[PDB]
Design an enzyme around this catalytic site. Structure first.
Site, PDB file in Angstrom:
ATOM      1  N   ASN A 104     -17.175  44.772 -32.464  1.00  0.00           N
ATOM      2  CA  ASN A 104     -19.017  45.436 -31.664  1.00  0.00           C
ATOM      3  C   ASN A 104     -20.041  44.251 -31.777  1.00  0.00           C
ATOM      4  O   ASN A 104     -20.803  44.010 -31.198  1.00  0.00           O
ATOM      5  CB  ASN A 104     -19.421  46.707 -31.986  1.00  0.00           C
ATOM      6  CG  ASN A 104     -18.501  47.716 -32.109  1.00  0.00           C
ATOM      7  OD1 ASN A 104     -17.867  48.903 -32.642  1.00  0.00           O
ATOM      8  ND2 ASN A 104     -17.149  47.496 -31.416  1.00  0.00           N
ATOM      9  N   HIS A 162     -14.902  57.178 -33.931  1.00  0.00           N
ATOM     10  CA  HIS A 162     -12.958  56.641 -33.816  1.00  0.00           C
ATOM     11  C   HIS A 162     -12.933  57.616 -33.414  1.00  0.00           C
ATOM     12  O   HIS A 162     -11.687  58.503 -33.229  1.00  0.00           O
ATOM     13  CB  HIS A 162     -13.370  57.009 -35.010  1.00  0.00           C
ATOM     14  CG  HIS A 162     -12.805  55.651 -36.189  1.00  0.00           C
ATOM     15  ND1 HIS A 162     -14.022  56.385 -37.221  1.00  0.00           N
ATOM     16  CD2 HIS A 162     -12.174  54.394 -35.825  1.00  0.00           C
ATOM     17  CE1 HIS A 162     -14.410  55.135 -37.715  1.00  0.00           C
ATOM     18  NE2 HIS A 162     -12.882  54.171 -37.360  1.00  0.00           N
TER      19      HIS A 162
HETATM   20 MG   LIG Z   1      -8.945  52.737 -37.844  1.00  0.00          MG
HETATM   21 ZN   LIG Z   2     -10.577  50.835 -34.818  1.00  0.00          ZN
END
Ligand SMILES: [Mg+2]
Ligand SMILES: [Zn+2]
Length: 329
Positions: free
Chosen positions: A239, A78
Protein backbone atom coordinates in the site's frame (compact mmCIF):
# COMPACT_ATOMS: atom_id res chain seq x y z
CA UNK A 1 -22.57 -11.26 -27.79
CA UNK A 2 -20.26 -8.15 -27.53
CA UNK A 3 -19.62 -6.35 -24.16
CA UNK A 4 -22.00 -3.66 -22.71
CA UNK A 5 -20.62 -0.08 -22.33
CA UNK A 6 -19.75 -0.74 -18.60
CA UNK A 7 -17.89 -3.98 -19.63
CA UNK A 8 -15.82 -1.95 -22.23
CA UNK A 9 -14.73 0.67 -19.59
CA UNK A 10 -13.75 -2.26 -17.24
CA UNK A 11 -11.71 -3.83 -20.13
CA UNK A 12 -9.82 -0.52 -20.75
CA UNK A 13 -9.00 -0.21 -16.98
CA UNK A 14 -7.75 -3.89 -17.04
CA UNK A 15 -5.11 -2.91 -19.70
CA UNK A 16 -3.10 -1.57 -16.65
CA UNK A 17 -3.09 -5.12 -15.08
CA UNK A 18 0.75 -5.43 -15.60
CA UNK A 19 1.41 -1.98 -13.98
CA UNK A 20 2.05 -0.93 -10.35
CA UNK A 21 -0.82 1.50 -9.52
CA UNK A 22 -3.83 -0.23 -11.20
CA UNK A 23 -7.11 1.63 -10.49
CA UNK A 24 -8.34 -1.29 -8.34
CA UNK A 25 -11.12 0.71 -6.57
CA UNK A 26 -12.44 1.79 -10.00
CA UNK A 27 -12.31 -1.87 -11.19
CA UNK A 28 -14.30 -2.80 -8.00
CA UNK A 29 -17.02 -0.26 -8.92
CA UNK A 30 -17.13 -1.13 -12.67
CA UNK A 31 -17.19 -4.95 -12.07
CA UNK A 32 -20.22 -4.74 -9.65
CA UNK A 33 -17.90 -5.51 -6.65
CA UNK A 34 -16.10 -8.36 -8.58
CA UNK A 35 -12.51 -7.01 -8.61
CA UNK A 36 -10.99 -10.38 -7.50
CA UNK A 37 -12.96 -12.42 -10.09
CA UNK A 38 -12.15 -10.14 -13.09
CA UNK A 39 -8.46 -9.49 -12.13
CA UNK A 40 -7.84 -13.26 -11.47
CA UNK A 41 -9.57 -14.14 -14.83
CA UNK A 42 -7.45 -11.50 -16.68
CA UNK A 43 -4.21 -12.78 -15.04
CA UNK A 44 -5.08 -16.49 -15.70
CA UNK A 45 -5.75 -15.69 -19.44
CA UNK A 46 -2.59 -13.45 -19.72
CA UNK A 47 -0.30 -16.18 -18.19
CA UNK A 48 -2.11 -18.99 -20.18
CA UNK A 49 -2.85 -20.86 -16.87
CA UNK A 50 -6.24 -22.29 -18.12
CA UNK A 51 -4.48 -24.12 -21.03
CA UNK A 52 -1.38 -25.20 -18.98
CA UNK A 53 -3.44 -26.70 -16.06
CA UNK A 54 -6.53 -27.66 -18.18
CA UNK A 55 -8.88 -25.49 -16.03
CA UNK A 56 -12.42 -25.32 -17.51
CA UNK A 57 -13.26 -21.57 -17.77
CA UNK A 58 -16.78 -22.09 -16.19
CA UNK A 59 -15.13 -23.91 -13.19
CA UNK A 60 -12.62 -21.01 -12.82
CA UNK A 61 -15.41 -18.35 -12.86
CA UNK A 62 -17.60 -20.40 -10.43
CA UNK A 63 -14.69 -20.86 -7.96
CA UNK A 64 -13.58 -17.17 -8.24
CA UNK A 65 -17.15 -15.87 -7.60
CA UNK A 66 -17.46 -18.33 -4.64
CA UNK A 67 -14.05 -17.24 -3.20
CA UNK A 68 -14.97 -13.52 -3.63
CA UNK A 69 -18.39 -14.11 -1.91
CA UNK A 70 -16.49 -15.45 1.22
CA UNK A 71 -14.68 -12.08 1.61
CA UNK A 72 -16.86 -9.84 3.89
CA UNK A 73 -18.33 -6.74 2.12
CA UNK A 74 -18.82 -5.03 5.60
CA UNK A 75 -15.02 -5.21 6.42
CA UNK A 76 -13.32 -1.97 5.30
CA UNK A 77 -9.75 -3.25 4.58
CA UNK A 78 -9.52 -7.13 4.61
CA UNK A 79 -12.06 -7.60 1.78
CA UNK A 80 -12.15 -8.76 -1.89
CA UNK A 81 -10.61 -5.43 -3.05
CA UNK A 82 -7.50 -6.07 -0.85
CA UNK A 83 -7.35 -9.71 -2.16
CA UNK A 84 -7.58 -8.38 -5.76
CA UNK A 85 -4.83 -5.79 -5.00
CA UNK A 86 -2.42 -8.39 -3.52
CA UNK A 87 -3.08 -10.75 -6.51
CA UNK A 88 -2.33 -7.97 -9.07
CA UNK A 89 0.76 -6.76 -7.07
CA UNK A 90 2.10 -10.39 -6.85
CA UNK A 91 1.46 -10.66 -10.66
CA UNK A 92 3.63 -7.53 -11.30
CA UNK A 93 6.41 -8.69 -8.88
CA UNK A 94 6.52 -12.14 -10.67
CA UNK A 95 7.17 -10.29 -14.03
CA UNK A 96 10.27 -8.45 -12.57
CA UNK A 97 13.25 -8.73 -15.02
CA UNK A 98 15.61 -10.22 -12.31
CA UNK A 99 13.15 -13.22 -12.01
CA UNK A 100 12.55 -13.86 -15.79
CA UNK A 101 12.31 -17.68 -16.42
CA UNK A 102 13.21 -18.47 -12.71
CA UNK A 103 9.80 -19.90 -11.57
CA UNK A 104 7.78 -22.84 -13.02
CA UNK A 105 4.10 -22.49 -14.10
CA UNK A 106 3.17 -24.47 -10.89
CA UNK A 107 5.13 -22.01 -8.62
CA UNK A 108 3.45 -19.01 -10.44
CA UNK A 109 -0.01 -20.69 -9.94
CA UNK A 110 0.83 -21.20 -6.23
CA UNK A 111 1.90 -17.53 -5.66
CA UNK A 112 -1.23 -16.14 -7.43
CA UNK A 113 -3.72 -18.65 -5.86
CA UNK A 114 -2.13 -18.00 -2.41
CA UNK A 115 -2.54 -14.21 -2.95
CA UNK A 116 -6.24 -14.69 -3.90
CA UNK A 117 -7.16 -16.81 -0.79
CA UNK A 118 -4.70 -15.23 1.71
CA UNK A 119 -7.35 -13.23 3.73
CA UNK A 120 -10.61 -15.07 2.75
CA UNK A 121 -13.40 -14.94 5.43
CA UNK A 122 -11.41 -12.29 7.45
CA UNK A 123 -13.74 -10.98 10.23
CA UNK A 124 -11.97 -7.55 10.47
CA UNK A 125 -10.30 -8.18 13.89
CA UNK A 126 -6.73 -9.40 14.75
CA UNK A 127 -5.48 -12.84 15.91
CA UNK A 128 -4.98 -11.31 19.41
CA UNK A 129 -8.66 -10.16 19.55
CA UNK A 130 -9.84 -13.71 18.54
CA UNK A 131 -7.52 -15.26 21.20
CA UNK A 132 -8.53 -12.84 24.05
CA UNK A 133 -12.27 -13.36 23.36
CA UNK A 134 -11.89 -17.20 23.45
CA UNK A 135 -13.36 -17.39 19.87
CA UNK A 136 -14.11 -20.80 18.25
CA UNK A 137 -11.40 -20.04 15.55
CA UNK A 138 -8.72 -19.51 18.27
CA UNK A 139 -9.86 -22.84 19.92
CA UNK A 140 -9.63 -24.76 16.66
CA UNK A 141 -6.15 -23.47 15.75
CA UNK A 142 -4.70 -23.51 19.32
CA UNK A 143 -4.13 -19.68 19.25
CA UNK A 144 -1.40 -20.20 16.53
CA UNK A 145 -1.66 -18.17 13.22
CA UNK A 146 -5.45 -18.39 13.79
CA UNK A 147 -6.62 -16.23 10.83
CA UNK A 148 -3.93 -17.53 8.40
CA UNK A 149 -4.87 -21.22 9.15
CA UNK A 150 -8.54 -20.24 8.61
CA UNK A 151 -7.86 -18.41 5.28
CA UNK A 152 -6.11 -21.57 3.92
CA UNK A 153 -8.83 -23.98 5.21
CA UNK A 154 -11.65 -21.92 3.57
CA UNK A 155 -9.72 -21.35 0.30
CA UNK A 156 -9.20 -25.14 -0.12
CA UNK A 157 -12.68 -26.19 1.23
CA UNK A 158 -14.39 -23.96 -1.41
CA UNK A 159 -12.84 -26.22 -4.17
CA UNK A 160 -15.47 -28.85 -3.10
CA UNK A 161 -18.54 -26.65 -3.96
CA UNK A 162 -20.52 -27.44 -7.18
CA UNK A 163 -18.23 -26.97 -10.28
CA UNK A 164 -15.49 -25.22 -8.15
CA UNK A 165 -12.52 -27.71 -8.37
CA UNK A 166 -10.13 -25.62 -10.57
CA UNK A 167 -7.34 -28.25 -9.89
CA UNK A 168 -9.49 -31.26 -11.06
CA UNK A 169 -7.06 -32.03 -14.01
CA UNK A 170 -3.74 -31.71 -12.06
CA UNK A 171 -1.89 -34.95 -11.18
CA UNK A 172 -1.61 -35.92 -7.49
CA UNK A 173 2.12 -34.86 -7.67
CA UNK A 174 1.13 -31.37 -9.01
CA UNK A 175 -1.63 -31.02 -6.32
CA UNK A 176 0.69 -32.04 -3.41
CA UNK A 177 3.42 -29.58 -4.58
CA UNK A 178 0.88 -26.70 -5.21
CA UNK A 179 -0.77 -27.32 -1.81
CA UNK A 180 2.52 -27.33 0.17
CA UNK A 181 3.64 -24.06 -1.56
CA UNK A 182 0.24 -22.29 -1.03
CA UNK A 183 0.29 -23.28 2.68
CA UNK A 184 3.96 -22.11 3.12
CA UNK A 185 3.11 -18.75 1.39
CA UNK A 186 -0.13 -17.94 3.32
CA UNK A 187 1.29 -18.90 6.79
CA UNK A 188 4.17 -16.46 5.95
CA UNK A 189 1.56 -13.57 5.80
CA UNK A 190 1.23 -13.71 9.64
CA UNK A 191 3.08 -10.51 10.78
CA UNK A 192 4.51 -12.54 13.76
CA UNK A 193 6.74 -14.24 11.06
CA UNK A 194 7.94 -10.89 9.50
CA UNK A 195 11.32 -10.56 11.36
CA UNK A 196 12.37 -14.20 10.51
CA UNK A 197 11.28 -13.79 6.81
CA UNK A 198 13.28 -10.51 6.53
CA UNK A 199 16.43 -12.02 8.22
CA UNK A 200 16.26 -14.97 5.70
CA UNK A 201 15.77 -12.53 2.73
CA UNK A 202 18.79 -10.40 3.96
CA UNK A 203 20.91 -13.63 4.31
CA UNK A 204 19.89 -14.50 0.68
CA UNK A 205 20.91 -10.98 -0.60
CA UNK A 206 24.40 -11.34 1.10
CA UNK A 207 24.96 -14.84 -0.56
CA UNK A 208 23.07 -13.84 -3.79
CA UNK A 209 24.09 -15.71 -7.00
CA UNK A 210 23.15 -14.67 -10.59
CA UNK A 211 23.54 -16.74 -13.83
CA UNK A 212 25.72 -15.39 -16.74
CA UNK A 213 22.28 -14.20 -18.13
CA UNK A 214 22.06 -11.82 -15.06
CA UNK A 215 18.95 -13.51 -13.49
CA UNK A 216 18.60 -14.79 -9.86
CA UNK A 217 19.85 -18.39 -9.15
CA UNK A 218 17.57 -20.47 -6.82
CA UNK A 219 18.46 -24.22 -6.99
CA UNK A 220 16.71 -25.65 -3.82
CA UNK A 221 13.06 -25.58 -2.54
CA UNK A 222 14.10 -23.68 0.65
CA UNK A 223 15.43 -20.70 -1.43
CA UNK A 224 12.61 -20.76 -4.07
CA UNK A 225 9.79 -20.79 -1.41
CA UNK A 226 11.56 -18.07 0.72
CA UNK A 227 11.48 -15.74 -2.35
CA UNK A 228 7.78 -16.54 -3.10
CA UNK A 229 6.91 -16.03 0.62
CA UNK A 230 8.72 -12.60 0.67
CA UNK A 231 7.16 -11.67 -2.73
CA UNK A 232 3.54 -12.20 -1.43
CA UNK A 233 4.52 -10.58 1.94
CA UNK A 234 5.77 -7.54 -0.14
CA UNK A 235 2.46 -7.56 -2.12
CA UNK A 236 0.54 -7.66 1.22
CA UNK A 237 2.60 -4.65 2.53
CA UNK A 238 2.59 -2.78 -0.86
CA UNK A 239 0.00 0.00 0.00
CA UNK A 240 2.67 2.62 0.97
CA UNK A 241 4.60 1.91 -2.34
CA UNK A 242 1.55 2.88 -4.49
CA UNK A 243 0.68 6.33 -5.90
CA UNK A 244 -0.52 8.46 -2.95
CA UNK A 245 -4.25 8.61 -4.06
CA UNK A 246 -4.32 4.76 -3.66
CA UNK A 247 -2.20 4.61 -0.45
CA UNK A 248 -4.53 7.18 1.23
CA UNK A 249 -7.65 5.09 0.39
CA UNK A 250 -5.98 1.98 1.94
CA UNK A 251 -4.95 4.01 5.04
CA UNK A 252 -8.58 5.28 5.47
CA UNK A 253 -9.80 1.64 5.19
CA UNK A 254 -7.26 0.05 7.64
CA UNK A 255 -7.90 2.88 10.19
CA UNK A 256 -11.73 2.38 9.88
CA UNK A 257 -11.19 -1.38 10.54
CA UNK A 258 -8.71 -0.82 13.47
CA UNK A 259 -11.00 1.85 15.08
CA UNK A 260 -14.01 -0.57 14.77
CA UNK A 261 -11.89 -3.24 16.60
CA UNK A 262 -10.96 -0.54 19.18
CA UNK A 263 -14.71 0.27 19.66
CA UNK A 264 -15.48 -3.47 20.14
CA UNK A 265 -12.55 -3.71 22.65
CA UNK A 266 -13.65 -0.52 24.61
CA UNK A 267 -17.40 -1.55 24.79
CA UNK A 268 -16.24 -4.88 26.36
CA UNK A 269 -13.69 -3.23 28.73
CA UNK A 270 -10.72 -5.02 27.00
CA UNK A 271 -7.38 -3.17 26.65
CA UNK A 272 -7.52 -1.18 23.34
CA UNK A 273 -4.93 -2.55 20.83
CA UNK A 274 -2.20 -0.26 19.35
CA UNK A 275 -3.50 2.21 16.64
CA UNK A 276 -7.15 1.09 17.42
CA UNK A 277 -8.07 4.05 19.76
CA UNK A 278 -9.93 6.68 17.60
CA UNK A 279 -9.75 9.10 20.66
CA UNK A 280 -5.92 8.62 20.98
CA UNK A 281 -4.64 8.17 17.35
CA UNK A 282 -1.89 9.78 15.20
CA UNK A 283 -2.72 8.29 11.74
CA UNK A 284 0.29 10.20 10.19
CA UNK A 285 2.84 9.24 12.91
CA UNK A 286 1.57 5.57 12.71
CA UNK A 287 2.17 5.44 8.89
CA UNK A 288 5.71 6.93 9.30
CA UNK A 289 6.38 4.30 12.05
CA UNK A 290 4.97 1.45 9.87
CA UNK A 291 7.15 2.58 6.91
CA UNK A 292 10.35 3.16 9.02
CA UNK A 293 10.25 -0.12 11.07
CA UNK A 294 8.35 -2.61 8.74
CA UNK A 295 7.69 -1.58 5.11
CA UNK A 296 10.96 0.27 4.16
CA UNK A 297 13.32 -2.40 5.65
CA UNK A 298 11.38 -5.12 3.69
CA UNK A 299 11.16 -3.25 0.34
CA UNK A 300 14.83 -2.02 0.67
CA UNK A 301 15.88 -5.72 1.00
CA UNK A 302 13.56 -6.79 -1.90
CA UNK A 303 15.01 -3.92 -4.08
CA UNK A 304 18.58 -5.27 -3.37
CA UNK A 305 17.49 -8.84 -4.39
CA UNK A 306 16.12 -7.66 -7.80
CA UNK A 307 18.45 -4.56 -8.22
CA UNK A 308 17.62 -2.31 -9.99
CA UNK A 309 14.06 -3.47 -10.97
CA UNK A 310 12.34 -2.04 -7.80
CA UNK A 311 13.98 1.48 -7.78
CA UNK A 312 10.71 3.38 -8.80
CA UNK A 313 8.69 1.41 -6.15
CA UNK A 314 11.30 2.26 -3.42
CA UNK A 315 11.29 5.95 -4.67
CA UNK A 316 7.44 6.15 -4.39
CA UNK A 317 7.72 4.66 -0.83
CA UNK A 318 10.29 7.34 0.28
CA UNK A 319 8.09 10.13 -1.29
CA UNK A 320 4.94 8.79 0.51
CA UNK A 321 6.99 8.61 3.77
CA UNK A 322 8.05 12.35 3.46
CA UNK A 323 4.44 13.35 2.63
CA UNK A 324 3.09 11.70 5.87
CA UNK A 325 6.04 13.19 7.92
CA UNK A 326 5.20 16.72 6.54
CA UNK A 327 1.52 16.38 7.80
CA UNK A 328 2.33 15.42 11.47
CA UNK A 329 0.43 17.85 13.81
MG1 LIG B 1 -3.68 -11.59 6.55
ZN1 LIG C 1 -3.59 -9.26 3.46
Amino acid sequence: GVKTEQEDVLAKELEDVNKWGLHVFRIAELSGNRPLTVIMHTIFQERDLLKTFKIPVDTLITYLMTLEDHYHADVAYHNNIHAADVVQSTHVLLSTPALEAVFTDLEILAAIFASAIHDVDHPGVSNQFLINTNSELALMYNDSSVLENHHLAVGFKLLQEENCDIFQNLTKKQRQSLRKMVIDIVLATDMSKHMNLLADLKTMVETKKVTSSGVLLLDNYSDRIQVLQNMVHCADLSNPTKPLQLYRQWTDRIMEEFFRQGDRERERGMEISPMCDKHNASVEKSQVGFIDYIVHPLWETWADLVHPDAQDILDTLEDNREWYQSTIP
